[PDB]
Amino acid sequence: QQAALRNQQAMAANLQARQIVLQQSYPVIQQVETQTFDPANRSVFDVTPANVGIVKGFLVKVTAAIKNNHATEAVALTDFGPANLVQRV
Amino acid sequence: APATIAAGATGELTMYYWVPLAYSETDLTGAVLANVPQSKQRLKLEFANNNTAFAAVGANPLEAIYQGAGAADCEFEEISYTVYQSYLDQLPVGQNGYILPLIDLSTLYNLENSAQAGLTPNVDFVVQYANLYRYLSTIAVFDNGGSFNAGTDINYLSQRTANFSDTRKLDPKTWAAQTRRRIATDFPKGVYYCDNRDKPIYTLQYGNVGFVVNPKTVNQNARLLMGYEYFTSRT
Amino acid sequence: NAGTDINYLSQRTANFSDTRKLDPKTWAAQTRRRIATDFPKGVYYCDNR
Amino acid sequence: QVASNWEGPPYMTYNQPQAGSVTLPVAGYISSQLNNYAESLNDYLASQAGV
Amino acid sequence: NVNNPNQMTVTPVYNGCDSGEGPQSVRGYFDAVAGENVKYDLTYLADTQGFTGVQCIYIDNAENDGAFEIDVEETGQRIKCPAGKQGYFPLLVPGRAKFVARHLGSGKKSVPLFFLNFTIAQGVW
Amino acid sequence: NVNNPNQMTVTPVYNGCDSGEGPQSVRGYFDAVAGENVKYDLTYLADTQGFTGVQCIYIDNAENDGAFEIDVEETGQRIKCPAGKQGYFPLLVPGRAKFVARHLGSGKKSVPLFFLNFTIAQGVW
Amino acid sequence: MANQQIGGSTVTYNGAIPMGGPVAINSVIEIAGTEVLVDLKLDYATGKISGVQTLYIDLRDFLGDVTVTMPDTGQRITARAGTQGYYPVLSTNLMKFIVSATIDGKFPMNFINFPIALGVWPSG
Amino acid sequence: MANQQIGGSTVTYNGAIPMGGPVAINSVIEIAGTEVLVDLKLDYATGKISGVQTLYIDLRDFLGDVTVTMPDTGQRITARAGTQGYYPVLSTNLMKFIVSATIDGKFPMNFINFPIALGVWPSG
Amino acid sequence: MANQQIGGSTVTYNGAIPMGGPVAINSVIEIAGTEVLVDLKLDYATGKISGVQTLYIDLRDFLGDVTVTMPDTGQRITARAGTQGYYPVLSTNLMKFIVSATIDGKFPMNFINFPIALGVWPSG
């Protein structure tokens, strides 16, 4: 098939340009939002990222302050544990 | 995260997530070029409220964080989040404009989850792969009605093709042996991982491949959660 | 101390612009991505390879 | 000794897709190609018979 | 629970699309009745002019004390407007545009009425 | 009940399609109505500007205690809005747009009102 | 919380404008003991009406309710006691209909085939 | 007076005509055990239905209410007790649905995918 | 007797299909003392939503009424107490909204931007 040579020549020009961007550009990591809330009020939030360059991922740091108000009994961590702090992304 | 939170105590938790767009650091496939004028770039996030993070004893601890006899009075005091964006600045500009990996930014790299039901003991349960995606990994969580077991409720797991042909029909201990040479440990009990990074499941150039779980014991309201990871383009 | 005496670690360029500016727990998270552990208490690593 | 339709031994290559071949077409598609349909059957039978 | 089909059904054709002319209504009152049936024969207007159908209807029973029926002939549709209401009603009318109106009020009620020929959705405020 | 036809009906033309300009509306208010009839003469706007017709109307009687009528001139349609409601009402208005409003409240009620120029279906919540 | 459903159907429907015209079908019925079947498959094959899209049910004199059921879908639209109405309907290329009532009565019904939005003449 | 807001959620929807067909999905719901999750992401990926745009909810014999929730949006369409109805929904490429009720019941539910205007059979 | 008005305003609107997508915005409102202002001018300039055309107002658990007011046109759509509903609104390119209620409470609100017709779940 003659159409499998152009789609391999388009991969060769693409991989030539990938190693130009990764070698001749600057990796930046900057904070876009931070917010502290109470989950009784709201728990779904929207984050507007920065519109610059070639975005290649997000690092999300979630903290919590769980308090047990029971009289005598305790709770224990589940198997998934703190990975259930973000319900959906 | 602390292992237990006693009556009257307060536990401090922290947790990090990497939401990927590009496939890796050296492979810019799935990356996003966000230098567009009227950009609609967006990152939604939902968090655990006081109804989904504390399960009672005998409940389903799947989306929960803590579970015990005192979960009826557990509550959050705060949740704080911080988002950091990793990107590449100072792109090479030429005479005709930007120099970019064009069919690397045209490709998406996606992560989806689902939930299937209808499991019967000693009957194969097939979940079909979508024909438009090139699947890279598969994660199956056998949630056996609020109970998780370390392989003692599954006969086998497989990746069956369209005719009837199986490609990896393994015992749950031998299935875990294949993931131990990838992530060097075991996933938690009930979680099963299938790696296809050396040869992705395209299921458009070789038939209709499905994912099979043959269970041994099925409780009431037992479901099978299926996480996917795949490439997507317009070829 | 384990990051409790630092507000943020950063790296600036000529026009005073931070190219990374992270929390001490987020600075240590990028360390764990490379050496699969934490450096000892008070040591902060920055990879630029 | 070369043949213009010989794809290899016919009991080993009859159900084999070609090299690139993401999705295969059908060999014919009144409603579509007709003499291209008839020559796509003659070329296949010449592969199974060796000139 | 037994099932029983039926013998024969009816099949007419309608005017559910847009006019080649513009939207045009026809104000049909001076029908002060209380005891009779009132025929509207719009076949006069359908061929002398380009009034190529009746699609919707507007009935105004704001001071009428009883209901108000209008019947289409070749279709057999039997739209009845309520007592003190008013509104728009879509219709199933063929090219032979004929209508028969009725009444149940307390004397002749002078009900204003409009034959629309274009599409307006239901609402019976 | 015997079938009796009638003598004569009328036929005006309307504005049921989309504007060549944009969707527009006209607000009519400060309606301190001690005198009952109030004229709205939108013919000033139709020829000077591009306000090429009134198709729908929005009446807001949320604080009105009585009903509220609006009358079209060439058509004779006399849409009445209920007491404590608000909603949208399609209209049959010709190219020479004049309106007459009236009232049955307990003093002047100020009645915010909109002449809508495009198509909005019925709903009188 | 949030247990997962096992099996659901997937059916094709009629939603466009036919190559003919707006064509309804008067199908006045009488139940009088239990049920009435309406089969319009003969009209679909023999060049007539191309698929029911809307129902017009007219029960202003009937003292009970009237139910119309599609067998290929399972939708069971139930018109109320003294009301008239237009009802959009989920019907297939197989036009079978199970009509029911309580005891008696005759109801004019129009199988309409073109889209008309919903409405019911009295409310409450 | 004049208290500005901080966070809103922008999200894309399904509002056009499918280039497949008008395709609805019967997914009869069993409650009096939990809340019910419906996931149609498998149908969207495997070539079937493109996106739920309208709901048909049939509550004729039920004594309570029925709530259907979209998780990407937060829309909480709540059908009432003895009524049937068509309801347009704001739903994304994720076709996940949280179905709930008060006590019991079996509900015929149709995930319609084409626009049908709203209506409810009895009102009040 | 036969009086004529003096002054009336003219406003240009949003009434067509966006060349983006069907896009609604969840903007959950808590008033709890007086009033709440919503300003969507920032989204309109920064490439997001083109203009609000419909509201979805969800008042099931709220025991009073809810008023939403457009400032450019003066339209003041008022939702009833225990009802949900879709409401077309007359809004300008300046997409400001003044939401009000009686006393308390939180209710979901969606700013829809594409035309949906009316509808209110219980009536009367």
Author numbering:
A (entry chain H): 11 to 99
B (entry chain H): 150 to 384
C (entry chain G): 298 to 346
D (entry chain N): 30 to 58, 96 to 117
E (entry chain R), F (entry chain S): 2 to 126
G (entry chain O), H (entry chain P), I (entry chain Q): 1 to 124
Question: Can you quote the paper on this entry?
Answer:
Bacteriophage PR772 is a ﻿double-stranded DNA (dsDNA) virus with a 70 nm diameter icosahedral protein capsid encapsulating the internal lipid bilayer along with numerous proteins and a 15 kbp long linear genome. It belongs to the Tectiviridae family and infects gram negative hosts like Escherichia coli, ﻿Salmonella typhimurium and other bacteria, carrying a R772 plasmid-encoded receptor complex through which DNA can be transported during bacterial conjugation. In previous studies on PRD1, it was shown that the capsid is formed by proteins P3 (major capsid protein), P30 (capsid associated protein) and the vertex complex. The vertex complex includes the penton protein (P31), the host-recognition protein (P5) and the receptor-binding protein (P2) along with the infectivity protein (P16) that acts as a cementing protein, holding the vertex complex together and also stabilizing the pseudo-icosahedral capsid of the virus.
The structure of bacteriophage PR772 was determined by electron cryo-microscopy. The overall resolution determined by Fourier shell correlation (FSC) @0.143 was 2.75 Å. The resolution in most of the regions was high enough (3.2 Å – 2.3 Å) to build a de-novo model of the asymmetric unit comprising of P3, P30, P5, P31 and P16 into the icosahedrally averaged CryoEM map. The CryoEM 3D reconstruction of PR772 shows that the viral particle follows a pseudo T = 25 lattice architecture with a (h,k) of resulting in an icosahedral structure with 20 large trisymmetrons and 12 penta-symmetrons. The P3 monomers (subunits a, b and c) are interlocked to form a trimer that appears as a hexon. The high-resolution structure of PR772 confirms the previously shown variability of the N and C-terminals of the P3 protein depending on the locations within the trisymmetron. The high-resolution also allows us to extend the analysis of these conformations and show that the N-terminal of P3 can adopt three different conformations, not two as previously described. The newly discovered conformation of the N-terminal region of P3, a long helix with a kink, is structurally critical to accommodate the interlocking region formed by the N-terminal hooks of P30 during the initiation of particle assembly. P30 adopts an extended conformation in an intact viral particle and it is found wedged in between the trisymmetrons. Five copies of P16 bridge the penton to the five trisymmetrons that meet at the vertex complex. Our studies show that unlike what was predicted for PRD1, the penton base of PR772 is an asymmetric heteropentamer consisting of three copies of P5 and two copies of P31.
